[PDB]
Amino acid sequence: PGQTPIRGIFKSIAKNMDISLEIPTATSVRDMPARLMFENRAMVNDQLKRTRGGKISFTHIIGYAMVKAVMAHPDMNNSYDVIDGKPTLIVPEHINLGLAIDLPQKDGSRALVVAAIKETEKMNFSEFLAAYEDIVARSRKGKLTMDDYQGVTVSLTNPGGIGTRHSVPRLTKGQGTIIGVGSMDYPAEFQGASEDRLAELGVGKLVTITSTYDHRVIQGAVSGEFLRTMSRLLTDDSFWDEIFDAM
Amino acid sequence: PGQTPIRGIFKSIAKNMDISLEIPTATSVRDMPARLMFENRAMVNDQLKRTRGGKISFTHIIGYAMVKAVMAHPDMNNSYDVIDGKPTLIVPEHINLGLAIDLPQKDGSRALVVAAIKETEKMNFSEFLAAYEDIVARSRKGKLTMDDYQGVTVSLTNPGGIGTRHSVPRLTKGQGTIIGVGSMDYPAEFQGASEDRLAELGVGKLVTITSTYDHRVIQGAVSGEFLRTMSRLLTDDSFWDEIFDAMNVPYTPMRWAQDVPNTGVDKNTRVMQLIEAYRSRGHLIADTNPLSWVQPGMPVPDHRDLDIETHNLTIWDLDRTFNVGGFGGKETMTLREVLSRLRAAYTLKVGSEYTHILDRDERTWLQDRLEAGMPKPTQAEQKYILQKLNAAEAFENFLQTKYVGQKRFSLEGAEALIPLMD
């Protein structure tokens, strides 16, 4: 009980959230079928098991889809700044994808920092998976440099791990959009039904995806088209041929 | 038409909303099953009706759950301030819960102010309900002081009353989070379907809950874990045991489970076995003891035969219809009505044992009279019972007064013997 000054990494988090009050933001929400993901992911993990490899996750697949979508709609990668006292649009060279890694510290308090996978627009699924696992691996061993925390152009967050249906997050300065992935579960009106009965009807599972963007440089139509493309890829013949070929 | 200055309470509302522009906020949304709430709330309100009490609401239950969740995740109670020009985290002493009360004024314009229930983390459900109703009662009579509007640490709002599905509200300065409760209704793609068809599938009702928090002091993971805890409590065995204990209801609460298929032994067979169990062993849970007393050294018989789980039935069967073979003078009935009648006949103030009798005509005679019930007595009859009770107690007290030490072997505690013999 009482009052206590904020110090350390927590002070940095507080300062940046205050800075972010100067970005006008809007959000879009879309729900997508997730049956084909479950099926095809299982097929890939069976191949890896016989060849004594590892295991891929849903975040890997949605991550790769997001990259392909940003290439199709490049405006989602731009940002805003005032330079020499004039408004300015910033068009980067690469797509650097920031992952929100929740890592506990020595003290025993959870604190998140966003690390980057760099130069993603010249990768196939095999290369992408390697880079992803590289960042994660070095984070646990505590071997991340200061260069890994710089140059992020677009971010990805996963509140669905705990079981949240969707969220409306904050956007940090220096980026144009942040994408959020929600729970992959039956709706709550079906959570007491029998397997037999659901199978008869033909009920599938969902995933809800959100897009929060800076409205000075990105318009609503673009954000909508982005989410429509992501929806099409996760149920597309040609998309899964790529992944299967590479693995 | 035209322009007009803002004055009064409205000016205060405008100023505070402008101040709130300096709080960075984020929101989380989660949907939760609500079937077990409907069931167990009904069970509690039945007990209150017989004891001539009141009636509990959904806001009471969700309110209490929210309190328990804040205790499990204390970070949700903190706030931010700049003191001596340094950033600071504020950790309060108590959990004070603000209620959004919409009250019309003398003029005829609606205006809301948030009142507080204080020191909530040291309350059980009975205490909580009393405090809640206290605030509401005094608000209508116009007897709230200035102290009641101060010291709020966390707030609760209910846009679902009108029928909104969910909202994204504003957070006011001096708090860390605000929680919102949405509509408890079927989704809109089912609002034209038949009851029969929904019952077959096993479709339930929802409730959507939101959390809007200050991002300088609360992180997203904490907000998510908070909502996950609330979801678990509203479908948890131990949670409902607390509520039932505090309100003095004698039955085991309905439990949460999945719907099972109608395979193997048919469900009509199972309902007939439940009827036989109550007729045979229902006396083991009847309300026949005036004291709330269990003797410590005595064995307690098994009475697992009287709950619907042992006969492979579930909450999802309560509104379906079954063949009951003349029970209640009907060929067909719902499981809800079956339970109701069984409990009225074999679990109130009279417990009976008669199923061991070998003759069929005897058994049927007793069975018919016990299930018809006790007929309502006239006013003359009622007054006659009161005279006899009075005579008993009065006689004992007189002798106590006039002859103190003398041995008489009193009947005090058992005065109902006199009207029984009569």
Curated annotation (Swiss-Prot), chain A:
In the N-terminal section; belongs to the alpha-ketoglutarate dehydrogenase family. In the C-terminal section; belongs to the 2-oxoacid dehydrogenase family. This is 2-oxoglutarate dehydrogenase E1/E2 component. Is non-lipoylated. In contrast, the E2 component AceF is the prominent lipoylated protein in C.glutamicum. The gene is odhA. Catalyzes the E1 and E2 reactions as part of 2-oxoglutarate dehydrogenase (ODH) activity, to convert 2-oxoglutarate to succinyl-CoA and CO(2). OdhA has reductase activity with 2-oxoglutarate but does not react with pyruvate, and also displays transsuccinylase but no transacetylase activity. Since OdhA is not lipoylated, the succinyltransferase activity of its E2 domain is dependent on lipoyl residues of the acetyltransferase AceF. Residues 1-236 are annotated as: Succinyltransferase E2. OdhA is a fusion protein with two major domains exhibiting structural features of an E1 and E2 protein, and a short sequence stretch of E1 localized at the N-terminus, which is connected by a linker region to the rest of the protein. Deletion of individual parts of odhA show that all parts of odhA are required for a functional tricarboxylic acid cycle in C.glutamicum; the ODH activity is in fact completely abolished in each of these mutants, and the PDH activity is significantly reduced, which could indicate that the overall structure of the supercomplex is disturbed. The chain holds residues 102 to 348 of 1221 of the full protein. Homodimer. Part of an unusual ODH/PDH supercomplex, consisting of AceE (E1), AceF (E2), and Lpd (E3) together with OdhA (E1+E2). Interacts with the FHA domain of unphosphorylated OdhI via its C-terminal dehydrogenase domain. It comes from Corynebacterium glutamicum (strain ATCC 13032 / DSM 20300 / JCM 1318 / BCRC 11384 / CCUG 27702 / LMG 3730 / NBRC 12168 / NCIMB 10025 / NRRL B-2784 / 534). The active site is at H215 (proton acceptor). Changing H215C: Loss of E2 succinyltransferase activity, and 2-fold reduction in E1 dehydrogenase activity. Disruption phenotype: Strains lacking this gene completely lack 2-oxoglutarate dehydrogenase activity. Deletion of odhA also causes L-glutamate overproduction and accumulation during growth.
